[PDB]
């Protein structure tokens, strides 16, 4: 449902 707009800034 949710995209890497979960702030997938690695780390």
């Amino acid at each position: 449902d949710a995209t890497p707009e979960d702030l997938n800034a690695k780390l």
Partner: antibody
Amino acid sequence: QDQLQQSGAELVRPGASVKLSCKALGYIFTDYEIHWVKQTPVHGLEWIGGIHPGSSGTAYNQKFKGKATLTADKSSTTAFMELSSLTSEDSAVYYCTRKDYWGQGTLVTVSA
Amino acid sequence: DIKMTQSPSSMYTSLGERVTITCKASQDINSFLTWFLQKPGKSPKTLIYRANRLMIGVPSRFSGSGSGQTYSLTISSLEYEDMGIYYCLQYDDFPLTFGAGTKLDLKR
């Protein structure tokens, strides 16, 4: 789906270590980060650190640097968190989360 | 680190009432916040992610809004299933920080 299942309750002696697991299901394991959150009656919610299974990147809370270690494993789509030198202040419920999905949590009790 | 000041800390509600929980960030967090509910002995259930996107499976009576430092979770009509403790989570910058949370309880 949308799931994260954590390993069972842990009873461990002070000075020892434990390694908790978080199995990811229903989504592409290497597209999101997996973070670990501690929760205790007295101290509330505490972010421990994150890990990107894709790049192996990690970020820790200064409070757990050198206490907690995060690792992921692409093949079993499982995130891991190891705590060392346990000492009652580490007795708590531990959660893994995708920021949106949360695991059911793992209860760790440190007692002699 | 970013501080999430959440209010009210406590709230005595009535079934079918409109509830508005608010979280203020110490700085701009660009909508990267989630609202989750947690019941006694249970694990967190996210209601909305990225300030206003409704979680799949979460009833529409739940909605979020906000833009820079001020975000709000609004519950259109309180149902029994909703009692618990609501929390906001900012994930715009590490370390991840949570609000103190608001405790909702049935009034009498």
